[PDB]
Amino acid sequence: QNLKSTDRAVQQMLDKAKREGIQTVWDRYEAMKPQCGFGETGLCCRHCLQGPCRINPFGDEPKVGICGATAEVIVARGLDRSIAAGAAGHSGHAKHLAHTLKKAVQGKAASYMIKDRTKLHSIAKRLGIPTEGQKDEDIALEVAKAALADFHEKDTPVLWVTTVLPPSRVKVLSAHGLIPAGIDHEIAEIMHRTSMGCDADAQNLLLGGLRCSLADLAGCYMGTDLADILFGTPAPVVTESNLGVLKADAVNVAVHGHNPVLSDIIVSVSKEMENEARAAGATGINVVGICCTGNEVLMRHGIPACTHSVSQEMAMITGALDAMILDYQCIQPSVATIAECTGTTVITTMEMSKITGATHVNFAEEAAVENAKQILRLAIDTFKRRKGKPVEIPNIKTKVVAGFSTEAIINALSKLNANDPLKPLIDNVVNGNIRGVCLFAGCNNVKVPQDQNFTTIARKLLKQNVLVVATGCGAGALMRHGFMDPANVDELCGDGLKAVLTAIGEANGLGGPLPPVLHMGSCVDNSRAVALVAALANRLGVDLDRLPVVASAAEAMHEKAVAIGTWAVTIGLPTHIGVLPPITGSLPVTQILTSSVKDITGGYFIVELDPETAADKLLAAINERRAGLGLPW
C-alpha cells in the first residue's frame, strides 16, 4: 500500500477497504491502465462533431486534425480550456462570497457579518474606495460591488489584478496585452477562441491562456479578501491532522469542498449543539476538515484536518464518519456510493454541485443557522445508527501549527523590526540564512504515490535553507508528515533556516521556532503568497522575476492547479509541475511554456516528474535569481 500512499493512516484504511471489497480511487486507476496516450500527450481534440481527432506523437498519419488543426494548436487549445475551467472554479467561489457579503450588509443574512473591519478598510483603500466618513456597511457594499464588477468589461481592467501586483509588473503584462478585461469575459473568450475554426496560432493561443490565468489569480485574491472580511484574517493556530483526529465517541462531521460560507457556520453551530449531541450518546460534535474548506476552518478556527485530495475516501472507510458536508470542487463522486457501505451521510448543499445518491440540503445564507442544524441533526441520527458498531480509526495524527496569513507573517517579522518588518526577512536572504522561498501548491494525483513528491522536494529545499510556504493539498501533504510541527525543525531544517525560524519564534513568545513550513491556507490563499512576494518586491524596488522565489505544484491534478501554475509563471516565477500536463505532444508548445515565456513574463514552467531532480532544478532556479541580485549562493 506504500506504492499507493506514503501516509500510514491511508495505508491502514486501504487494507480495510481491500478486505471489505470497497473500491477506491487507486483501484479505479488500476482499472484504467493503460491510459490513452493521445490524451496524455495532448494530441486529442473533440471540439467539434467531426472528431475525435488524434495525432500520433511519432510515426505516420494521422498527423493533423480533420479541420487542419496542427499538434501545436490542438495542445494549446486543450491547455487554454483547462485554464478557463480553473478560473471558473476559483472565481465562482469568489463570486459566491461577494454575493454573501452584499447580503450580509444589506440586512438579508444576519448569520454573516463584517468580522475583520481592518481588512475591509485596507481592501477598500487598495481599490480606491473612500472610507473616511463612511459607514462600514456602505464601504463593504462598495467592495462587494467592485468584486462583482471585475467579472465583466468596464472602464477599468480587473482591479483584483492591477491593484495587487507592483506597477512594474502590471506594465510588463499590459505591454503584452495580458491584463484581463473581466474574469468571466476572459473565460468566455477562451472558450470562443478555442472552438473549431477560430484561433489557430500557438503563441496567440497561449498568450490568451496567460491572460485567463490572471483572471484566475483575481478570483483567488478576491476569494481570500472576501473570506477574510467575512470570517476573519487567519492568525497562528495550533491543531492536528490525519485520520486520528476522528473520535469514535463523537459525532464526526467532515466539511469538504472549497467555499467556507457554509462550513464556517457549521463550525459555530456545532459548538452550540453539543448538548443535543450528548443527549444522543456522543461526547459532542467533532468537526474535521477535508480539502480546502477544511483548510479554511483550520486556518481560522483550528479545526483539525482529517485528510486531503486523493485519500478523501479513506475517512469514510474508518466507519466513524457520520456526515460529510459538501459544497463544490475536488469531491470524488465515489463518496456517494461508498456511503452506502460505510454508513456515512453525504450531504450536498450547492445548487450547481449535486451527486446522485447523496442527500441535498438547499443552503441559503438567509437560512444558514437553520440549515446547519438540519445537517448536523442528520449527522447525530447517523451517529446513533452506529451504536455498537466497531470502527477502525488509525491512531495516527500530527501536530500542526498553521494560520500564517501574510498579515500574520508580517506581524511575526515585525517583532524583529517594528517599523520595517520585511527587512529581517530580506536581511537573511542577503546573508544566506534564507536561500529563497518556495511555495508548494495544488493537489495530490493518483499517478504519484501520495505525498511523495511534496515531501521529497521539501526535505531537500529545507536542508538548503529555503523558506517553504504551502497551501491547499500541498499544505495537507506537508502537515500530515510533520512539516508543520516545530518539534521537527532540528531534523528538517538547515542551520541558517533554523536560526531564522528560531529568532522569529522566540521574538513571538514561543520559546521555540516557527514550524518548518508555513501554512498560508487554502488554494485561493495562494493569493496570500502573491501578496507577500509582491510586498517583498516593492520593498526591494524590483519585479517578482528578480526575486529568489519559486513555486511547485508537485502532484497537480485539478484544472484549478493548472490555472494557478500558469499565473505563477505569468507573474514571474519559476514554476515546477510534478505531473505531466498534456503538452508533450507538441515540442513548440513545450518550448514556449518552459523557455520562451521567460522573455515575456520572466517566469517559466519546470516540468519534472522525478522529485529529487525537481528539487535540484528548483534550487538552481533560486540560485540563478540570487546570482542576478549579486548575492552569494
Binding site for [4Fe-4S] cluster, by residue number, is: 36, 44-45, 48, 53, 67
Q: Give the one residue of 6, 10, 38, 47 binding ligand SF4; rule: CB under 6 A.
A: 47
**CA angle, corner 553, sides to 549 and 557, nearest 5?**
160
Q: What is the DSSP secondary-structure string of 254-284? A: EEESS-HHHHHHHHHHHHHTHHHHHHTT-S-
Segment interacting with ligand SF4 (CB under 6 A) among 62-70, 129-137, 419-427, 527-535: 62-70
Q: Give the one residue of 148, 149, 170, 196 binding ligand SF4; rule: CB under 6 A.
A: 196
Tell whether residue 57 is a contact of ligand FES (CB under 6 A): no
Could you give the 3-state DSSP secondary structure of residue 337?
A: helix
Tell whether residue 53 is a contact of ligand SF4 (CB under 6 A): yes
Tell whether residue 67 is a contact of ligand SF4 (CB under 6 A): yes
Nearest CA to 159 among 229, 208, 222?
222
Beta-sheet pairing, 437-440 with 517-521: unpaired
Report the binding-site residues for [Ni-4Fe-5S] cluster: 258, 292, 330, 443, 473, 523
Tell whether residue 67 is a contact of its own copies (CB under 8 A): yes
Q: Give the one residue of 23, 27, 52, 154 binding ligand FES; rule: CB under 6 A.
A: 52
Q: Give the one residue of 9, 17, 105, 200 binding its own copies; rule: CB under 8 A.
A: 200
Tell whether residue 512 is a contact of ligand FES (CB under 6 A): no
Bridge partners (DSSP) of residue 518 are 469
Distance separating alpha carbons of residues 110 and 227, to the nearest angstrom:
16
Length, in residues, of the chain: 633
Least Å from the CB of residue 36 to ligand FES? 3
Tell whether residue 54 is a contact of ligand FES (CB under 6 A): yes
Segment interacting with ligand FES (CB under 6 A) among 37-45, 113-121, 137-145, 321-329: 37-45
Determine contact, residues 286/415, Cβ cutoff 8 Å. Answer: no
Which residue lies nearer to ligand FES by CB, 56 or 203? 56
Binders in 68-107 for ligand SF4, by CB under 6 A: 69, 74
Least Å from the CB of residue 50 to ligand FES? 13
Task: Tell me, by CB under 6 A, how many residues bind ligand FES.
Answer: 7
Q: Which letter, b or e, does each residue of 207-221 get, where b requires 16 or more Cβ atoms within 10 Å of its Cβ?
A: bbbbbbbbbbbbbbb
Which residue lies nearer to its own copies by CB, 82 or 406? 82
Distance separating alpha carbons of residues 217 and 145, to the nearest angstrom:
19
Q: Which long-range contacts (CB under 8 A, 24 or more apart) does 43-48 make?
A: 43/71, 43/74, 43/75, 43/585, 43/586, 44/74, 44/78, 45/69, 45/74, 45/77, 45/78, 47/77, 47/194, 47/195, 47/196, 48/195, 48/196
Binders in 571-630 for its own copies, by CB under 8 A: 579-582
Tell whether residue 195 is a contact of its own copies (CB under 8 A): yes
Beta-sheet pairing, 237-241 with 398-402: antiparallel
Tell whether residue 38 is a contact of ligand FES (CB under 6 A): yes
Q: Give the one residue of 39, 284, 343, 588 binding ligand FES; rule: CB under 6 A.
A: 39
Binders in 232-251 for its own copies, by CB under 8 A: none
Tell whether residue 36 is a contact of ligand FES (CB under 6 A): yes
Which residue lies nearer to its own copies by CB, 47 or 625? 47
To the nearest 10 degrees (0 to 180), the angle between helices 472-480 and 452-463 is 80
Tell whether residue 44 is a contact of ligand FES (CB under 6 A): yes
Determine contact, residues 48/40, Cβ cutoff 8 Å. Answer: no
Which residue lies nearer to its own copies by CB, 266 or 563? 563
Task: Return left, alpha or beta for 291; rule: phi > 0 is left, psi -120 to 50 is alpha, else beta.
Answer: left
Name residues whose C-beta falls within 8 Å of residue 303's C-beta, 6 or more positions apart in sequence.
Answer: 239, 255, 267, 287, 288, 289, 294, 297
Segment interacting with its own copies (CB under 8 A) among 43-51, 410-418, 490-498, 511-519: 43-51
Tell whether residue 176 is a contact of its own copies (CB under 8 A): no
Give the torsion sign (CA, 483, 484, 485, 487).
Answer: positive
Contacting positions for ligand SF4 (CB under 6 A)? 45-48, 50-51, 53, 65-67, 69, 74, 196
Contacting positions for ligand FES (CB under 6 A)? 36, 38-39, 44, 46, 52, 54
